[PDB]
A paper describes a structure:
Human multidrug resistance protein 4 (hMRP4, also known as ABCC4), with a representative topology of the MRP subfamily, translocates various substrates across the membrane and contributes to the development of multidrug resistance. Moreover, hMRP4 transports various endogenous signaling molecules, including cyclic nucleotides, folic acid, eicosanoids, urate, prostaglandins, leukotrienes, and conjugated steroids. Unlike bMRP1, which contains an extra transmembrane domain (TMD) denoted as TMD0, hMRP4 presents a typical ABC transporter structure with two TMDs (TMD1 and TMD2) and two nucleotide-binding domains (NBDs; NBD1 and NBD2). Here, we captured four distinct states of hMRP4 along the ATP-driven transport cycle, including the apo inward-open (no substrate or ATP), substrate-bound inward-open (no ATP), inhibitor-bound inward-open (no ATP) and ATP-bound outward-open (no substrate, but ATP-Mg2+) states.
Therefore, to collect sufficient NBD-dimerized hMRP4 particles for 3D EM reconstruction, besides the engineered EQ mutation, we also introduced two cysteine mutations in each NBD (E568C and Q1275C) to stabilize the dimerized NBDs of hMRP4 and added 2 mM ATP-Mg2+ in the whole hMRP4 purification process. However, the EM density corresponding to the disulfide bond was not observed in the ATP-bound hMRP4 map, indicating the dimerized NBDs were mainly stabilized by the binding of ATP molecules, as has been reported for other ATP-bound ABC transporters. We found that a majority of particles adopted a closed NBD conformation based on two-dimensional (2D) class averages. We obtained a well-defined three-dimensional (3D) electron microscopy map with an overall resolution of ~3.5 Å, enabling us to build the atomic model for most regions of hMRP4. The structural comparison revealed that the structure of the ATP-bound hMRP4 presented a conformation resembling that of the outward-open ATP-bound bMRP1 and ABCD1 rather than the outward-occluded human SUR1 and ABCB6 (hSUR1). The hydrated cavity in the ATP-bound hMRP4 structure was exposed to the solvent and open to the outer leaflet, thus indicating that the ATP-bound structure we solved is likely in an outward-open state. The ATP binding induced the patching of TMDs by forming extensive contacts between the two halves of the transporter along the entire vertical axis. As a result, an obvious outward-open cavity was created by the curvature of the TMs, forming a substrate-releasing site. As expected, the NBDs formed a pseudo-symmetric “head-to-tail” dimer through the binding of ATP molecules, which were well-solved in the EM map, displaying clear densities corresponding to ATP and Mg2+.
Author numbering: 6 to 629, 680 to 1301
The structure:
Amino acid sequence: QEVKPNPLQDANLCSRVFFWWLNPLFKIGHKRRLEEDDMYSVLPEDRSQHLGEELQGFWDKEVLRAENDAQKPSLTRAIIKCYWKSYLVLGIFTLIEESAKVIQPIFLGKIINYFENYDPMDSVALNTAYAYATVLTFCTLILAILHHLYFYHVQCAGMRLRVAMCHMIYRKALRLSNMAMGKTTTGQIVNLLSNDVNKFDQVTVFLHFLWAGPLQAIAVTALLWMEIGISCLAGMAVLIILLPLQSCFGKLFSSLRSKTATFTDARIRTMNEVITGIRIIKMYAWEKSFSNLITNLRKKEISKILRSSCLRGMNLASFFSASKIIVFVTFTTYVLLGSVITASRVFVAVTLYGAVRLTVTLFFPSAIERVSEAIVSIRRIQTFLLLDEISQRNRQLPSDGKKMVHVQDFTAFWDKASETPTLQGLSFTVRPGELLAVVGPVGAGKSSLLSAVLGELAPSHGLVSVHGRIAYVSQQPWVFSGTLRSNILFGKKYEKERYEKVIKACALKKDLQLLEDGDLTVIGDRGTTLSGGQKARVNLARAVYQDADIYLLDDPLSAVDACVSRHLFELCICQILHEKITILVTHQLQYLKAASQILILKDGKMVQKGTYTEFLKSGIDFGSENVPVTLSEENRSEGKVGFQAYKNYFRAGAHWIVFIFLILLNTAAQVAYVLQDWWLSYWANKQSMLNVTVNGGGNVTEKLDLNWYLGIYSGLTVATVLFGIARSLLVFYVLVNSSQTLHNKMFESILKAPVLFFDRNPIGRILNRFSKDIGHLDDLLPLTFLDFIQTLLQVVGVVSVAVAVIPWIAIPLVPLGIIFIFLRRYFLETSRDVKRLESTTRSPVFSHLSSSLQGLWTIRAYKAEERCQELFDAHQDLHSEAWFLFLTTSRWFAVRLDAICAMFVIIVAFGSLILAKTLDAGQVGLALSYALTLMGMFQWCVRQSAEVENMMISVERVIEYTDLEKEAPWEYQKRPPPAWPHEGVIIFDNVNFMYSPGGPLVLKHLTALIKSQEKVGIVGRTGAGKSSLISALFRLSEPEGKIWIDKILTTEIGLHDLRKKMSIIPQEPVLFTGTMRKNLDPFNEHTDEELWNALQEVQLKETIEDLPGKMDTELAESGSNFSVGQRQLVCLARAILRKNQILIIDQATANVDPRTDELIQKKIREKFAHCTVLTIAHRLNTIIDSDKIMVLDSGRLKEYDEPYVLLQNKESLFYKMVQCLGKAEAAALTETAKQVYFKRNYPHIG
Ligand SMILES: Nc1ncnc2c1ncn2[C@@H]1O[C@H](COP(=O)(O)OP(=O)(O)OP(=O)(O)O)[C@@H](O)[C@H]1O
Ligand SMILES: Nc1ncnc2c1ncn2[C@@H]1O[C@H](COP(=O)(O)OP(=O)(O)OP(=O)(O)O)[C@@H](O)[C@H]1O
Ligand SMILES: [Mg+2]
Ligand SMILES: [Mg+2]
C-alpha cells in the first residue's frame, strides 16, 4: 500500500520552478474526483518524526541551558536557533527583489523620456530605449518568476515548523502528570493543535517584508530626493508618524489575542460534556441548559474579537488610504512653494508609489499582526510545555531473576493543598503464585494502592519496587476506535490457539456468536457501541492476552452478571492468573474464600492484614460488506456549488437594506478614488496649459484659484478616507455577525441530532468542525473577502480609466479574460477536492488525539507510547501530504498567471511599435506602465478570487450541517395533561427496538404489564436488552409496536414532554466540569436547604463539608478528582432532586460497598414508597424484596412473575442463577423472598 514516490524529488530546476510535474495530477482530477490514493507523499526530510525529534533536542538543550543559567526558559530562542540556518538564505532573494522593485520605476520613467522628445534622426535614443526595454524584461522576469518559488519554500518551512510544534505538543501531552491534568482539559490541547499552530505557517512569510519595510522606504525617499527638494521630507514625516502607530498596535493585538485564546479555551472545554454525554442530556432534557452557556460564551468571544476585527479593518483601510495621503503630502507643499508640476514629477511620484505601497502599506501591518499572534501562540505553547510532567520510572536495580512487588511504609498525597493524606501505613508484599484481596468502604483508597504500583502517584514518604510488566485494568473500560480483534490484540500478534482459549475463558463466545460479524465488527469511540458488561470483559481479555507479570484488576466484576461472574472468576483468575502476580479488588464477600492475603483498608489506613481464616477465628468482620470502519469518508460531489451558499452567507450577516448600503458605499468609495486621480490629472493639464499660454506671450496673468483647488482636493481626499473606513468597518461587522449566526445555527442544529449520529460519527469528525472550520471564519474569512472586494473595485476602476483611451489597447482584453476564466475553472475543479481531502485527512488526527487523551492511563500502563507516536506521525503526514499538494497547486496556478501576464506585457510592448512608429507619447507613451498596472491588478484579483472560492468551499463544510435531519419534534400539537403521569401504568404490546435500520434485532416480541406503584426488577445475562428496553421507553430511537403510558401512546406526544416526566439513573458515571452547585443542578432552582437534605440522604455531605468550598470546588474533566463511588452518589443525588413520578434505576450499585448500598436502598424504599420504581441491578440482595422480577434472556421475555414463584421452580432461569454465589447467601435470599411473599399475601397470619 506504499504510495508512489513524489515526482518533485526526481525533477530538475526547470520543471520545479514552473511546477511542470503537476500535469498528470490535474489531468486525472479534471476527469474524476480525487481520492486518498492519488495524493503524493511528502519528502523524507518533511516527516513528522524527523522534525519533532529534531526540535525536541533543541528544546532540551535550551531548557538545560536555562536550568544551568537559573532563569526562565524561552521557546523563541530555540525556534530561532533551529530554523534560522534554513531561513537566512531566503533573505537575499527578498533583498534583491525589493531593490528591483525600486529600479523598475526608474527605467519606466526613463523610457518615456525618449517618447517625450521623439526624433526620427538619432539612433542612440532608440538604442538606449531598447536597452531600457531589455533591462525592464530582465527585472520583471526575476520579479515574477522566482517569487512564487520563494513563497513555496517559505510555506514549506512554515508547514515543517507547524508539524514540529504539533509533534512537540503531542509528546508533552503524552507525559502530563495527574497534578497538571487538573489545570488543563482536552479543549486546551484541541485548541493548541487546531488554531494555535495555524499562525506559524503565516508569520514566517511576512517577517521579511517587516524588516525590509524601512530599508526600502529610506531608499525610495533618497531616490525621490534626487528630483524633489526639501518639500519631500513631509512624506518621511508621515511615514515615521504612521509606522510607530502600527508598531504600538501590536500590544493591543497581543492583548486581544490573549483574551480570545483564554475565552476559546473555555468555549472548547464545554464539548465533552455535550457530545460524549448526549444520552445523559437527552434523558434529562438539559439541552437548553447547555445552550444558555455555549451561546453566551460564543457571544462574549464575538464581542472580544470585535475589537480585533475593527483594528484589522482600520489597518486594511489605511493600506489604500496612505497612498492618497502621501500623494496629497509634499504636493500640498510643492504647489504652495511657487513651483508647479505638469507631467514629470507627478508621473514619477505615482509610478514609484504604485510599487512602494504594495509592500509598505500591505505587508507591514499584516506582519505586525502575525508576529503579535505568534508571540501569544509561542507563550501558550511554552506554558503548556512547562506543566508538571509525570514522575519517570527510575532505573531498577539488577535482581536475581525473580519478580516481586514490595511496598513498605508508603505515604503520598494526591493533592498537595489538602491536609490529610490518601494512604497511611502500607506494608505488604506479593509473590508469584499468591492472590491479594483488597476490601474497603467507598472512598477508602482501594484504587490508590493499584495506582501507586504503576507510578502515577508520587510517593511523598517511602519507597516502591516494581519488577516486571504490568497489565492494569481500569475501573472504567476504555475502548478506542477499531474492531474488537484490534482491541483485544492491542499491538500483539494474532494467535488463534490462544485467542480461542481467551474467548472461551472470558465467556465471550456467546457475545461473538450473537453479533452479526463476530470479532470483526467495528466499535465506536468511548465504547458507545458495546455495553458496560461487554467492555468490562473485553478489557480483561486484552489484559490476559498480553501475557504480563502484574495484573492490577481494579474491580472488573462490578458491572457483570452474577451468573457469569462465578464462571469468569473460576476460569480467568484462579486458573489462568494462578502463577502470575495479581491484586484483585472487589466488594463481594464470596470470592475472598480463595484468596490468601486480604488487606482490609479503611480511609487509607491498614486496619487488618492476614488470611481469610484469621478474621473468622479472631471474630472481626469486614462487611459492616463487513461494516466498513466507522463510516469512512462521505464528503463528495463538490461540483461547482452555486449561489445557494452565498445567499445564506450574505443573509446571515444583516438585512437587505444593509447589504445594499454596503455596495452603495463601496461604489461611492471607488468613484471617489477614481475622481481623485481624475481631478489631479485635470489640474496638471490646466497648469501645463497655463504655463504654455504664459510662456507664449503671456499678456494676461490669471493665476489658478490656489485655495479653492487645495480645498477641493483635501475634501475629496477626506471623503475617500472616510468612505473607505466606513465600508471596511461595515464589511467586517457584517462578516463577523454572519459567522456568529452560522455558528449559533450549527450549534442549535447539532443538539437536535439523533443518538445514531453521535455514535456513528467519531468524536474527532464533529470536534474538528467546532474549533478549526468555525474558527477560520474569524481569522481568514473576512481578511480574504475584503482583500478581494477592494481588489475587484480597483480593477473595475482601472478598467474604467483605461477605456477612455483608444480601444487599440482594450481589444486584446477579451482573449486574456477568457483564458484567465478558463484557467480559474480548470484550477478550482482540482483545488476544491484537494482542500476536501486535506480536511478529511486532518480529521483523523483529532479523532485519534481525543481517544488518546482519554486512554493515556492504559497507554502508560501498557507502554505503547512508541506505537501511539508512530500512529500520530502517520495521521499527521496523511494531512501534511494534502497540505503540500494544495500549496504546490496554488503556486503552479500563480506561476502560470505570472507567465501569461509577462507574455501579454511583452506582446503589448513589442507588437505595438510597428503601428506606433509615428504615434508619439500622450497616446502611445505611458501605455506600457498602464498595461503593467493592469496586469498587476489582474494577477492580484485572480488570486483573491481563488482564495475566496477556497474559503467558500471550506465554509461549505459548516453550511452543509444546516439541515441535519432530526427525529420527532420536541413538542407536538397534542400536549399531555399537566397531571400526567398521574398513575404511571406502563403497558407494552409487541414492542421492538433496533439501534440501526436493518440491523440485528434486539427485542423480539416483548410483552409485559407494569402496574402503578409496583417495584419491578429486571435481571438476566448481560447484553440481552435490559438497556435496550429503557432506550425504547425513553424514545432515543424510533421503536416498533406500541408503548402505552397511562392510556397515552408514546409515539403521539412530544419527546421532551415524555422525557421530562420520567427520571433515570445513568449506567455509566459522568460529571460536568464546573462547580458542585452547577453539577447538581444547572438551572439554579433548588434551595440550599433541600440540597443539603438530599446530600444527607445520599450520605455524601459528611465528606463534602471537609472541603472549604463545599459548593465552589471546581471539578476536573469528567470528574478526575471524584471517584466512581462519588460519581454514583452524585448521580443518585441528582435523581433524588429530580423528584418525578416515574423513576427508572439502571445501574446504581455497581461499585458501592454493601453497607452504604443497603443504607441507600433502605433510604430509597422509605422515600419513593408511593411511586413506580423500575430498579435494575445484578446483585439480588437489593431486589429480592420486589413485587415482580423480569427475566430477559436473549431479548425475549422468558418468564415474568413473583420472586417467590420463580424460586419455587427449579427450572426457572432466575432460580438457576440464584443457585450460584454460594449456598448461605442463596438460602438467605430465598428466606427473605418467602417472608416478603407471606407478608404480602397473608397478613392475617404473617
Ligand atoms: N485526581 C485526584 N485528586 C484528588 N483526589 C482524588 C483524585 N482521584 C481520586 N481522589 C480521591 O480518592 C478517593 C478514592 O480513592 P480510590 O480510587 O483509591 O478508591 P475507590 O476505588 O474510589 O474506592 P471505591 O471502589 O469503594 O469507590 C476519592 O474519595 C477521591 O477524593
Ligand atoms: N449503537 C449501537 N450499534 C450497534 N449495536 C448496539 C448499539 N448500541 C447497543 N448495541 C447492542 O445492543 C446490546 C444492548 O445491551 P445492553 O446495553 O442492554 O446491556 P446491559 O443490560 O446494559 O449490560 P449490563 O447489565 O452488564 O450493563 C449490546 O449488546 C450491544 O451489542
Ligand atoms: Mg473504585
Ligand atoms: Mg445496563
